[PDB]
Design a protein around this ligand. Structure first.
Ligand SMILES: CC(C)(COP(=O)(O)O)[C@@H](O)C(=O)NCCC(=O)NCCS
Ligand SMILES: CC(C)(COP(=O)(O)O)[C@@H](O)C(=O)NCCC(=O)NCCS
Ligand SMILES: CC(C)(COP(=O)(O)O)[C@@H](O)C(=O)NCCC(=O)NCCS
Lengths: 157, 157, 157, 157, 157, 157
């Protein structure tokens, strides 16, 4: 059972770690796929995001961090993934998640979308807000792995 | 991995069959657990709902149908399940799901709640709606397993 | 074009009057159909709700008030209606509406469900809320047609 | 400023304690008003719910617990309150809140409805869920004040 | 009865065709109005969008495809439209649709907003996602009229 | 009791006036804080927005209009505010408001978020839509204070 957990992870947060950890307990191998070509230019580059994610999940043996470009479904297919991990926060855009799941099912029926729920601790935060806050002189240490915290300070300095 | 798909299944519809089927393709064994749910004054008795579900899933070798009146978390632990399956078809079916999911996580942290999405075909139906239509002699053959439709027909009028 | 505005109308409020009025300006004939809805244990009998609605819409020459206990789709077909009217005032009043709408489309595909939006003035009221307030002797004259308020006053205390 | 926190509190949970506490830090005096709510067939009698709330808030010197069967707006006016407190933990708990809020504003315009947000810890619980879990002998000590848990234990089984 | 169905239609999809077709069955004349001056620059130009829409609705006799600039309400007024067609997908932003409907009612009270529901087949897809997917090497043939499909390939080539 | 009511107020609307007025009736001093460095470039400059807001709230004695940059929470802290005013429209993005409230609670626990509800009159409009409409030759006089109306005409001229 190969599962894929795609996203921009710009940067990876404790919420992401929470989700991927829960996934590794259900599936044999989990590919943490980092989107290589966003439309929004990232705060961190693909290479940086991959490095941060690799370090943050170094302790997770069955987790593989890999960057990818173009369509996520095409990458999942080539990686032979049959499970698509999606984190559902309390503040998630449910309607959007439904569009995404149905579109991905259309593109690759053999890839089953599964939604996991993070701890209440990370159920109300998003990478978008974390960056915004950090960029505006706010403390977001609590939401990030130590390595990501150190990298973010250098990035905003 | 042993997964438990809990619900009232009063009656089990094609929507439920859709969800349990996706579950069996993902996990080794799936226990479709039917709760007594007396506070809901079910149309069919627990024994009836169990028989209907057993027949409706006879073709699924990895599905085991069982009834229970225990606390969901205790039953899951006692059934040796570590994954809890629930279907998501609408926003309303999200806030309520998070409460149960977090409550179950509190009672049994190792029980991971997984949410699956049904086919577009069954995204707008529920046991409740099917029963209401049937109570008015409307054709619901399209939404129920054969044995269940017969049972529902016989149960009414 | 013949349109049918179905509901329990227990009792019909100014919100309903608002919707049916917008309906008459759009379609040639509008049938305000009151469902028996026994499972809801209506405050007023079907006969009472029909009389209240008839009086409350006496000024609307294109509105016909009728009661029914049949399957909504069959009644619509038998009334020669091809448009089904429903009001939308909130998100909750959307997911539930889509289920009925898709179920009715399944039973009678030529019956097109149309959703209208009430005035801001009636966007937060419902028959249920009005009754609850009235049960506590609160002033609800503002939300109900004159004849309906009298009837509600008489019905209670 | 005198504020009134109305609800059924059947039973009062740690979530309610969280909300009322935030209320006392904001307003001089807070009246936790427990509605009879007979249509809800409360588990505990009004007298019982009042006693449970009184004990659960004994440490809060600015909180006054009272029971009422009157129209919420009239009781608020008669209690000389000008602020109405309500907690928000989910979307569902928003559309329903706006209806009551606008209805109360109609009955008593000077009564300003204020919405507070509970801690993440209590964002997914409700009296209803706690009771359902307790009816199945599940451990709910974590979500209820000590005296309330004892009372709930004694009330059941 | 003249109805207007406004949008950017960039490009027109099967969901749009579904909605406009349902509209032509209720109203005498339907103006498929294509927004001429978006803020987001279109994938296809206004002229292209009009050509694609005209071809895709060539079989619909009472449909008129027309481009317009500035305020939709001002165009509707000059076109003497009294019905404003809005498609409501399951994944629609309901709150936004309410803002839009109320703003348009403020601008032109004589223009009544009517919401139609597409088939379940097109209830979870948006032009936004279709473009995104196509632009990233995904197959979206299923969601577009043949002529639109051919035009999109040339556009992305 | 010092409360802060932050926002971009670009420009200030009747909805904003409604909310700040309700706030001044509950708290001793209200700081209407205008965001100085948005990401979206404003229609009106910070200086203009402050001037417009000052004029529009000139009649409100306990209201202080002040511009601020960087993190709102840091400004609130330095201003010694303990109440954070948030307006909740019927068309509000509730999930987003929850993210914001929780993030701000993390940043400054002593700042309590309180949500107020505007009149039904302003419950379905946003500054975003008002600007869009005005920019496209639509009448938005009804939603703005006279001074803001005059300033907007000059701005778009
Ligand atoms: C049956 C169900 C899964 C709900 O499913 P439903 O929406 O199909 O009725 C839930 O009510 C349940 O778990 N019941 C058993 C009693 C219990 O433990 N309840 C607390 C659940 S958190
Ligand atoms: C009465 C109503 C329109 C619902 O309206 P309501 O929200 O006003 O109670 C619906 O329950 C109905 O159509 N009842 C008739 C029985 C039926 O056919 N039910 C299936 C509807 S899909
Ligand atoms: C008790 C409550 C505050 C609702 O709270 P709840 O969600 O905790 O049950 C409401 O039902 C109420 O105000 N009841 C008193 C009767 C009344 O005036 N109802 C109309 C309220 S608009």
């Amino acid at each position: 059972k190969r599962a894929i957990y795609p996203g921009t992870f710009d940067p990876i947060t404790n919420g992401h770690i929470d989700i991927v950890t829960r996934a590794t307990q259900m599936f044999d191998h989990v590919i943490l796929a980092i989107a290589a070509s966003p439309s929004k230019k990232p705060m961190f580059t693909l290479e940086e995001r991959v490095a941060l994610a690799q370090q943050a999940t170094a302790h997770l043996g069955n987790v593989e961090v890999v960057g990818f470009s173009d369509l996520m479904a095409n990458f999942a297919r080539n990686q032979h993934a049959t499970v698509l991990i999606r984190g559902l926060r309390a503040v998630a855009d449910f309607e959007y998640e439904m569009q995404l799941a149905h579109m991905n099912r259309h593109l690759m029926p053999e890839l089953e979308s599964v939604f996991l729920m993070p701890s209440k601790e990370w159920s109300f935060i998003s990478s978008s807000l974390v960056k915004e806050v950090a960029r505006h002189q706010g403390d977001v240490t609590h939401f990030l792995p130590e390595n990501v915290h150190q990298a973010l300070m250098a990035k905003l300095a």
